[PDB]
Design a protein around this nucleic acid. Structure first.
Lengths: 109, 75, 95, 97, 83, 83, 97, 95, 109
DNA sequence: CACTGGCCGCCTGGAGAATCCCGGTGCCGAGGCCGCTCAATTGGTCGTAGACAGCTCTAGCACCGCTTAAACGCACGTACGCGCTGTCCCCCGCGTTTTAACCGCCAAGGGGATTACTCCCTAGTCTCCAGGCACGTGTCAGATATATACATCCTGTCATGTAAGTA
DNA sequence: TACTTACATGACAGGATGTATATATCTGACACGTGCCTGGAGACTAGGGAGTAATCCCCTTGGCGGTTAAAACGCGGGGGACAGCGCGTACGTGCGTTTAAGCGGTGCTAGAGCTGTCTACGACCAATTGAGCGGCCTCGGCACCGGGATTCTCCAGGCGGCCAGTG
């Protein structure tokens, strides 16, 4: 007489896996106990981050008139947002290249 | 129009006549104070000073080329 | 047949579809996205563990995650993530 | 008369070319050889995934482009446009090596 | 079998291309050898850690997994090979 | 109780002394106010971290151990304060 | 005529003294007042352990001495002995701020 | 009546007297040694934790910390450390 | 009846507390299991590290005609050992100061 | 003395080439469907981590009175950034020749890596005890002060080399 | 044309002052004794992670032929590095002054912290399923090829300014 199996991601109205992130926290050994709201909150944080970065990547690709996200688009999306740049200054995206940035002394008169 | 550049360079160097030769920067300031477009005539004054040092009316004190110090001839 | 290797494929794809109904993603950029989410998850988990240690608390709470996100994410990213997590935890507590 | 661009113009044009482009800039297989050469200095008979050579490569252009951008900043700081040994040493000194 | 000198395989045009990606306009002649030395030093700093990881795993094969893990430890974290 | 212009409390000779410890011989006069700005940025970051630690503990008295934690999170490790 | 040293010699003696000495270079009370002002922006009615202000003081002097030694490196890189603001922005921008 | 606050005074003092019979200590430097051993403990323990986790190993062994000390300490610090650690675990095995 | 008490540090011939290191490893959430020789090895490396740093501190104190270690001695010990300085590069010692270090162009003549 | 050609700098249009942009085409990764299985879920339980109230005590804060150390400021000086120019050479661009990188194609085998087994090792629990320690005390290494000795820095002075007037 | 004299320069002695150096002194911070209790150790068990044996197959290594893009080399040359030299300023240094930090003392209390209660809350665990991953197939987005237009670049050519030679 069990109830229907509903999902905690749908309970939070989210698509990031609440159960799987909770599993990764429990087996990732950060404490012996993990509160119930913590993986939900974390999944919301991750989903917001991924949503806005894919948003920036989508506008970059649409600006690049490509309908598919390529790592160059991700690199442009990271480095054109200063807060994500400060978040991710220490990382390298594979095959991302760099921003087109020219020092003014390099350009001719 | 007025006079050409050689006379004003001679006036610039003969206005002061320090023990050491006059520097090019002070000479530019002197000719600007007298009133002259030094901006589009840097090449003009440099070739003029080479012309006048080469023709012996004025002698180079210390420097080489347009740099350094310029003082008058012995007589 | 080979054993299952976990990925963040379907979740990030569904989020991309919600934020952009039309566009697609390459597979290698998709692996980059997987690495991104894994790295950020690791960072927040590490901060949560350290604050749990510092306050001698045995339990990772939503408060601890909120404090860790405010620690790590800068500015409007921090308060927007706080707002999103707050809305999510209010929805989950309301079942 | 045969045609010839002035110096730097080709340089700036392929600045724009390589900053627009994303692909690898080191030749693949000599880099793979160099990686194995370093590997046998620590342990003999090492074997490498192809992706391992790829990842060492991506990290290598990552560190080299970052170092070279910082030395470019050091060089334009010294009122020059050509990077020098002192630029490399300076960038590694502030960066922490 | 053995390898005795392959550092010249990172050719002078390759250093030129790397400088071009970084935005460098003009490169001195003495640059190339010490950039080979710098890329050298960075490589044994990474690969020493990588083979330490590998021998800890009792494997004789370097993975890109261990390479990006060595980059993770060393502080030049890489996206695009994890997992 | 209200504090209005406290950045000038880090006086000019104090910055001169700090530059002397750093090995600086000659300092421009334009230096001091932007070092006040940079120092303000450093403290506002680290105190933002430490204050966040403090309100996390449901305390409103700042302890030194949290300041050690904040410098740890900035990677600026400090010994000598019970770390 | 009263005695007077040439410039830098007093500065070099300051270098040797303050690199020899270990005590604080900024005054205690205005720094504590400044820390209270900065923390007033985030939370009202904070109190501070004295050791917390001391640790923040150590962080401040350590960060600034590091900043000025890298600034000195930048200045001598530009063939100068006088540091100027572009040295500090260069050092911070290479270091990652 | 007090609550318990732990530190590493006696061990640093004994090893100091072992390396120098006549050399003293100040209390501030003594706290610096306390925080030093704490920090090196967190570094080695955390990297041992990653070496354990990432290879699907649930246990810290002596081999785990041997790999970790090989990682963090540069050059002959690593070799001397692994040498005396090997000698110490050998004595503990023999006793 | 029962064996007489024997410390594990004395079993390893060490001064650093093997039992306390084991306890802190268990409560430090690094793994749920810790091998028996693992804290022995960790105490050994900690004892060794303290040995060279305190030895260099004592040598610097002897150079300063000082009987007791001051934090200045610790700063001098770390920054004059490039192996330790590589270990503790991002590290501040409180009240340690810096090395006497003057660039060559700063000197007169 | 005035005219006029000649040299230099500046402005401008045109030719060529890299690139942008427009098409077609064929291809292979992306996306979507299906099968599968294994990990999230439900529900309950149990033990316990932390919230909550309360009580203590200590240290952080507020105030104040002297007490000089330091900060402010100004003035004089000098040395340092720096702007300009001139020179030299060194690296960019381009053409030619070479060469090995790459592709792509095929063989081999060795090691990841998976499953199974069986076993040593480690967490757990109870008991016991001794080592680390808060706390107290005393006491000498070092701070502090005073008096010397020398290092060092800046300057005045004397011998020398060189430019200049002149017999 | 060579001789004698004035100015710039460099070497050296010497004084002022800062800094080492010897010694008295007191002091409080370091060093050591003591009650103790709490965390470390002994012993034994459950059980399980993990070492190890066997296999496989997949991925890595090895090697061979062809092409050509890339590397190497040489020439040329122009542009950047940089040395030097003057200038003007802008900090350093040293004097005096203000004041505000700093030290010492006092009082308050607010919050840190520590103790007891309990109760919500999260881990454990058997049964269950459906959500997410492995595998397969297709096609259309996109890489590649090809052709026209555009922009950029570099240089040839035209115009003005000044200057110097000559009738």
């Amino acid at each position: 007489a069990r109830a229907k199996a509903k999902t905690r991601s749908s309970r939070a109205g989210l698509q990031f896996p609440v159960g799987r992130v909770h599993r990764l926290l429990r087996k990732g050994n950060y404490s012996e106990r993990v509160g119930a709201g913590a993986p939900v909150y974390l999944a919301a944080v991750l989903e917001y981050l991924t949503a806005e970065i894919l948003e920036l990547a989508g506008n970059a690709a649409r600006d690049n008139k490509k309908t598919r996200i390529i790592p160059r688009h991700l690199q442009l999306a990271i480095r054109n947002d200063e807060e994500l740049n400060k978040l991710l200054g220490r990382v390298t995206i594979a095959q991302g290249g760099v921003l087109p940035n020219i020092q003014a002394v390099l350009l001719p008169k | 129009s007025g006079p050409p550049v050689s006379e004003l360079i001679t006036k610039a160097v003969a206005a002061s006549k320090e023990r050491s030769g006059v520097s090019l920067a002070a000479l530019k300031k002197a000719l600007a104070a007298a009133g002259y477009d030094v901006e589009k005539n840097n090449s003009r004054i440099k070739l003029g000073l080479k012309s006048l040092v080469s023709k012996g009316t004025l002698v180079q004190t210390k420097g080489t080329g347009a740099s350094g110090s310029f003082k008058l001839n012995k007589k | 047949k080979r054993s299952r290797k976990e990925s963040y494929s379907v979740y990030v794809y569904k989020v991309l579809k919600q934020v952009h109904p039309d566009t697609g993603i390459s597979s290698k950029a998709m692996g980059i996205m997987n690495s991104f989410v894994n790295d950020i998850f690791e960072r927040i988990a590490g901060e949560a563990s350290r604050l749990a240690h510092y306050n001698k608390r045995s339990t990772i709470t939503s408060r601890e995650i909120q404090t860790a996100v405010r620690l790590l994410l800068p500015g409007e990213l921090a308060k927007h993530a706080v707002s999103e997590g707050t809305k999510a935890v209010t929805k989950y507590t309301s079942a | 008369k045969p045609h010839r661009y002035r110096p730097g113009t080709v340089a700036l044009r392929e600045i724009r070319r390589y900053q627009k482009s994303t692909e690898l800039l080191i030749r693949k297989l000599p880099f793979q050889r160099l990686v194995r050469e370093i590997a046998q200095d620590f342990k003999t008979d090492l074997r490498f995934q192809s992706s391992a050579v790829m990842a060492l490569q991506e990290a290598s252009e990552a560190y080299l482009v970052g170092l070279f951008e910082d030395t470019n900043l050091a060089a334009i700081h010294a009122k020059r446009v050509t990077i020098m040994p002192k630029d490399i040493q300076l960038a590694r000194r502030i960066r922490g090596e | 079998k053995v390898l005795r000198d392959n550092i010249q395989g990172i050719t002078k045009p390759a250093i030129r291309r790397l400088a071009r990606r970084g935005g460098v306009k003009r490169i001195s002649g003495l640059i190339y050898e010490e950039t080979r030395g710098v890329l050298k030093v960075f490589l044994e700093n990474v690969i020493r850690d990588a083979v330490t990881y590998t021998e800890h795993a009792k494997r004789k094969t370097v993975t890109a997994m261990d390479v990006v893990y060595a980059l993770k430890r060393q502080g030049r974290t890489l996206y695009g090979f994890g997992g």
